[PDB]
Design an enzyme around this catalytic site. Structure first.
Site, PDB file in Angstrom:
ATOM      1  N   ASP A   4      36.130  32.948  30.337  1.00 12.35           N
ATOM      2  CA  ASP A   4      35.365  33.993  29.675  1.00 12.35           C
ATOM      3  C   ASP A   4      34.600  33.511  28.437  1.00 12.35           C
ATOM      4  OD1 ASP A   4      34.658  36.669  30.074  1.00 12.35           O
ATOM      5  OD2 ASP A   4      35.880  37.347  28.433  1.00 12.35           O
TER       6      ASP A   4
ATOM      7  N   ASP B 200      45.821  37.735  36.304  1.00 15.32           N
ATOM      8  CA  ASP B 200      46.116  38.421  37.564  1.00 15.32           C
ATOM      9  C   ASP B 200      46.498  39.885  37.328  1.00 15.32           C
ATOM     10  OD1 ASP B 200      47.089  35.303  38.529  1.00 15.32           O
ATOM     11  OD2 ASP B 200      45.998  36.404  40.021  1.00 15.32           O
TER      12      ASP B 200
HETATM   13  F1  LIG Z   1      43.717  37.686  22.772  1.00 14.52           F
HETATM   14  C1  LIG Z   1      43.771  36.359  22.969  1.00 14.52           C
HETATM   15  C2  LIG Z   1      43.776  35.487  21.884  1.00 14.52           C
HETATM   16  C3  LIG Z   1      43.835  34.112  22.102  1.00 14.52           C
HETATM   17  I1  LIG Z   1      43.840  32.813  20.462  1.00 14.52           I
HETATM   18  C4  LIG Z   1      43.889  33.594  23.397  1.00 14.52           C
HETATM   19  C5  LIG Z   1      43.880  34.431  24.514  1.00 14.52           C
HETATM   20  C6  LIG Z   1      43.829  35.818  24.354  1.00 14.52           C
HETATM   21  N1  LIG Z   1      43.822  36.703  25.389  1.00 14.52           N
HETATM   22  C7  LIG Z   1      44.043  36.439  26.704  1.00 14.52           C
HETATM   23  C8  LIG Z   1      43.209  37.084  27.760  1.00 14.52           C
HETATM   24  C9  LIG Z   1      42.088  38.037  27.445  1.00 14.52           C
HETATM   25  N2  LIG Z   1      41.793  38.534  26.241  1.00 14.52           N
HETATM   26  N3  LIG Z   1      40.765  39.335  26.341  1.00 14.52           N
HETATM   27  C10 LIG Z   1      40.368  39.383  27.613  1.00 14.52           C
HETATM   28  N4  LIG Z   1      39.348  40.108  28.078  1.00 14.52           N
HETATM   29  C11 LIG Z   1      38.453  39.610  29.111  1.00 14.52           C
HETATM   30  C12 LIG Z   1      38.911  39.964  30.529  1.00 14.52           C
HETATM   31  N5  LIG Z   1      38.187  39.079  31.443  1.00 14.52           N
HETATM   32  C13 LIG Z   1      38.952  37.974  32.020  1.00 14.52           C
HETATM   33  C14 LIG Z   1      38.164  37.066  32.967  1.00 14.52           C
HETATM   34  O1  LIG Z   1      36.780  37.337  33.232  1.00 14.52           O
HETATM   35  C15 LIG Z   1      36.063  38.437  32.654  1.00 14.52           C
HETATM   36  C16 LIG Z   1      36.778  39.389  31.695  1.00 14.52           C
HETATM   37  O2  LIG Z   1      41.189  38.546  28.468  1.00 14.52           O
HETATM   38  C17 LIG Z   1      43.459  36.811  29.105  1.00 14.52           C
HETATM   39  C18 LIG Z   1      44.471  35.952  29.530  1.00 14.52           C
HETATM   40  C19 LIG Z   1      45.305  35.310  28.624  1.00 14.52           C
HETATM   41  F2  LIG Z   1      46.270  34.490  29.072  1.00 14.52           F
HETATM   42  C20 LIG Z   1      45.129  35.532  27.168  1.00 14.52           C
HETATM   43  F3  LIG Z   1      45.940  34.906  26.303  1.00 14.52           F
HETATM   44  N1  LIG Z   2      40.327  37.370  16.013  1.00 11.76           N
HETATM   45  C1  LIG Z   2      39.316  38.237  15.770  1.00 11.76           C
HETATM   46  N2  LIG Z   2      38.855  38.434  14.528  1.00 11.76           N
HETATM   47  C2  LIG Z   2      37.847  39.294  14.273  1.00 11.76           C
HETATM   48  N3  LIG Z   2      37.227  40.013  15.228  1.00 11.76           N
HETATM   49  C3  LIG Z   2      37.590  39.913  16.515  1.00 11.76           C
HETATM   50  C4  LIG Z   2      38.684  38.995  16.879  1.00 11.76           C
HETATM   51  N4  LIG Z   2      38.842  39.080  18.203  1.00 11.76           N
HETATM   52  C5  LIG Z   2      37.931  39.974  18.661  1.00 11.76           C
HETATM   53  N5  LIG Z   2      37.185  40.473  17.655  1.00 11.76           N
HETATM   54  C6  LIG Z   2      36.091  41.474  17.772  1.00 11.76           C
HETATM   55  O1  LIG Z   2      36.442  42.515  18.689  1.00 11.76           O
HETATM   56  C7  LIG Z   2      35.333  42.811  19.542  1.00 11.76           C
HETATM   57  C8  LIG Z   2      35.814  43.209  20.933  1.00 11.76           C
HETATM   58  O2  LIG Z   2      36.689  42.209  21.446  1.00 11.76           O
HETATM   59  P1  LIG Z   2      37.179  42.199  22.978  1.00 11.76           P
HETATM   60  O3  LIG Z   2      37.630  40.795  23.295  1.00 11.76           O
HETATM   61  O4  LIG Z   2      38.125  43.353  23.193  1.00 11.76           O
HETATM   62  O5  LIG Z   2      35.846  42.495  23.833  1.00 11.76           O
HETATM   63  P2  LIG Z   2      34.645  41.431  23.924  1.00 11.76           P
HETATM   64  O6  LIG Z   2      34.655  40.575  22.684  1.00 11.76           O
HETATM   65  O7  LIG Z   2      33.398  42.182  24.319  1.00 11.76           O
HETATM   66  O8  LIG Z   2      35.056  40.455  25.134  1.00 11.76           O
HETATM   67  P3  LIG Z   2      35.760  41.019  26.456  1.00 11.76           P
HETATM   68  O9  LIG Z   2      35.003  42.280  26.782  1.00 11.76           O
HETATM   69  O10 LIG Z   2      35.542  39.912  27.453  1.00 11.76           O
HETATM   70  O11 LIG Z   2      37.208  41.224  26.087  1.00 11.76           O
HETATM   71  C9  LIG Z   2      34.455  41.568  19.548  1.00 11.76           C
HETATM   72  O12 LIG Z   2      33.082  41.927  19.560  1.00 11.76           O
HETATM   73  C10 LIG Z   2      34.816  40.820  18.281  1.00 11.76           C
HETATM   74  O13 LIG Z   2      33.801  40.997  17.308  1.00 11.76           O
HETATM   75 MG   LIG Z   3      36.747  39.317  24.468  1.00 10.03          MG
END
Ligand SMILES: Fc1cc(I)ccc1Nc1c(-c2nnc(NCCN3CCOCC3)o2)ccc(F)c1F
Ligand SMILES: Nc1ncnc2c1ncn2[C@@H]1O[C@H](COP(=O)(O)OP(=O)(O)OP(=O)(O)O)[C@@H](O)[C@H]1O
Ligand SMILES: [Mg+2]
Ligand SMILES: Fc1cc(I)ccc1Nc1c(-c2nnc(NCCN3CCOCC3)o2)ccc(F)c1F
Ligand SMILES: Nc1ncnc2c1ncn2[C@@H]1O[C@H](COP(=O)(O)OP(=O)(O)OP(=O)(O)O)[C@@H](O)[C@H]1O
Ligand SMILES: [Mg+2]
Lengths: 291, 303
Positions: B135, B162
């Site tokens: 991602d 998954d």
């Molecule tokens: F919040 C986090 C902070 C850290 I530092 C590392 C990973 C994550 N999050 C995730 C995530 C995760 N955190 N946010 C999303 N959102 C995107 C979902 N999609 C997954 C694949 O393709 C499109 C969207 O996925 C997924 C798997 C995993 F093992 C993780 F540890």
């Molecule tokens: N560690 C962090 N510190 C500050 N802001 C964060 C952090 N992680 C995420 N954000 C903010 O939160 C918002 C949304 O995060 P989130 O991952 O839920 O959706 P996304 O960034 O659009 O990606 P996805 O939709 O793939 O999860 C992001 O636009 C980012 O600015």
């Molecule tokens: Mg994200």
């Protein structure tokens, strides 16, 4: 019936009773109001938007108060909470149609006739009386209850709620690009019926022996490709009546223009036949859901 | 930042600001009671809740061993009424997507510095651990006032992936076609990400000459927003996006193009890109990323 019994709603007045469901940006919960002992479902929508249009989102959601039909889910009230926007609505004790499909392996035509009606009318309501389409018709958005009522839920009244936001029920024209209207929901409803008919999401159309586990006689781009470029699902011509057969086959014509419209369906022989039929739907519900 | 508390209690947290949400997650600005440390907390509201939910947190733990100046910090993760909570380092500069909103388009020298960290963070997870990001996209490249560029939302736990919306996709043509995710897939996600930050908008409906004149007029050569299928079907079947001519260096041009080759086997790999003259040039030409980041974001702080 009408909720004059209550009024303005704040956060504290509510008390959690049960957990109803979770979706793509939304948790729903059975709650009670303090002032009046009414069980209403609470829709938490966890979101991030400026202190400016969160009011504008609430403002646009206020027209739901103007939405009153025995086929549209009752709307109590909506407000801004520290973290999320809540929508409190009429509590449907039968839950969702896929919920009841989860219990009852398939759903019988007689019932599906009563469903088709309630959707067709519900659709017509928002179109005639509010000039808006229900851009998300699916089994999870058709709510039932022990009173015998089938009601529609979760329609995009708020334009700026949409903007601030395994299966797909969307229509060919909605995926392909331009030209999309109230014909899209017909497709939605059509597929949704074919789902509850056969037993599962029917867009990989069940093969010669797939449905046989009920009677005698995968990728996200791949999916979207099938809906757009491959023939639509049909009801197998065995257990279902030629008229139900024809009904759904009219809802799942790819070309929206060719596809039957609200009036054509509402006066379709299947609907008429269903309209005068006597079915203890409240009874069938309780016979399965147990309440 | 190698701050430590470190056993995390749900009631030790306090909602300050909302950070955002999307694709199964809700990022929140929270304060820790027994440290006073403003962290970011992600609510992945995951449904199923048996011994699998128990494998998720157990699988997430490898994030404690995940340390690089190019990967966002990790305080821990826990089960809290089904919905799991990953607590992570609060990046006060926000996502690169956020900086694109406040800044015009990003200057190609700053993207060079960004390009170093994506490749290095990408390669770190690739080599030291064995996971890939799944991602890469502007909103997942986080920046800060100290001048750091980091990576989050990478797939540490197989189970979490998954276990869990197409406004605009960063998925590689070959992934959409169901061949499983590779290194080259992240590479493609990086390219598109660069072209996005370079040009100021999601490039997949490509800017026509006229529109490019409105972006940096008038050095220019080679309305509505596409529907879901329309978009992906474009990404697959139609030619990849490109950097406009005579505005960015021929080297930057070739870099991003090697990133955006539709054939994943023909696409540049991590080694080609790290040794690319665009990345070599970007290393020697030290540019104040902290100064730029802070001045265009009105965020100037002592690190
Ligand atoms: F919040 C986090 C902070 C850290 I530092 C590392 C990973 C994550 N999050 C995730 C995530 C995760 N955190 N946010 C999303 N959102 C995107 C979902 N999609 C997954 C694949 O393709 C499109 C969207 O996925 C997924 C798997 C995993 F093992 C993780 F540890
Ligand atoms: N560690 C962090 N510190 C500050 N802001 C964060 C952090 N992680 C995420 N954000 C903010 O939160 C918002 C949304 O995060 P989130 O991952 O839920 O959706 P996304 O960034 O659009 O990606 P996805 O939709 O793939 O999860 C992001 O636009 C980012 O600015
Ligand atoms: Mg994200
Ligand atoms: F909860 C409700 C009860 C009633 I009665 C009517 C509407 C709603 N909710 C909504 C909703 C809504 N209710 N649930 C969802 N869930 C998300 C559905 N989507 C999934 C993917 O992409 C876009 C929307 O959206 C949206 C717009 C709107 F104007 C509404 F009033
Ligand atoms: N008023 C209600 N009364 C009883 N149950 C409800 C009510 N509203 C929603 N539910 C249940 O809660 C679940 C969550 O609904 P929600 O609209 O948040 O997501 P969904 O419909 O499951 O899928 P999506 O996220 O695509 O809309 C539904 O599946 C439904 O079974
Ligand atoms: Mg719903």
């Amino acid at each position: 019936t009408q909720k004059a019994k209550v009024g303005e709603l704040k956060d504290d007045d509510f008390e959690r009773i049960s957990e109803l469901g979770a979706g793509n940006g939304g948790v729903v919960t059975k709650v009670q109001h303090r002032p009046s002992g009414l069980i209403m479902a609470r829709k938490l929508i966890h979101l991030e938007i400026k202190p400016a249009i969160r009011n504008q989102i609430i403002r646009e959601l206020q027209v739901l108060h103007e939405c009153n039909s025995p086929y549209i889910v009752g709307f109590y009230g909506a407000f801004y909470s520290d973290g999320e926007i809540s929508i409190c609505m009429e509590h449907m004790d039968g839950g969702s149609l896929d919920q009841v499909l989860k219990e009852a392996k398939r759903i019988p035509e007689e019932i599906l006739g009563k469903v088709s009606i309630a959707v067709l009318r519900g659709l017509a309501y928002l179109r005639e009386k509010h000039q808006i389409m229900h851009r998300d018709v699916k089994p999870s958005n058709i709510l039932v209850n022990s009173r015998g009522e089938i009601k529609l839920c979760d329609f995009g009244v708020s334009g700026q709620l949409i903007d601030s936001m395994t299966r797909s029920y969307m229509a060919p024209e909605r995926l392909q690009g331009t030209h999309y209207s109230v014909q899209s929901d017909i497709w939605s409803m059509g597929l949704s019926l074919v789902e509850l008919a056969v037993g599962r999401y029917p867009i990989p159309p069940p093969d010669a022996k797939e449905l046989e586990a009920i009677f005698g006689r995968m990728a996200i781009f791949e999916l979207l490709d099938y809906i757009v470029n491959e023939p639509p699902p049909k009801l197998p011509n065995g257990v279902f009546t030629p008229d139900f057969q024809e009904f759904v086959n009219k809802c799942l014509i790819k070309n929206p223009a060719e596809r039957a419209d609200l009036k054509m369906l509402t006066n379709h022989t299947f609907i008429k036949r269903s309209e005068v039929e006597e079915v203890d739907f409240a009874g069938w519900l309780c016979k399965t859901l147990r309440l």
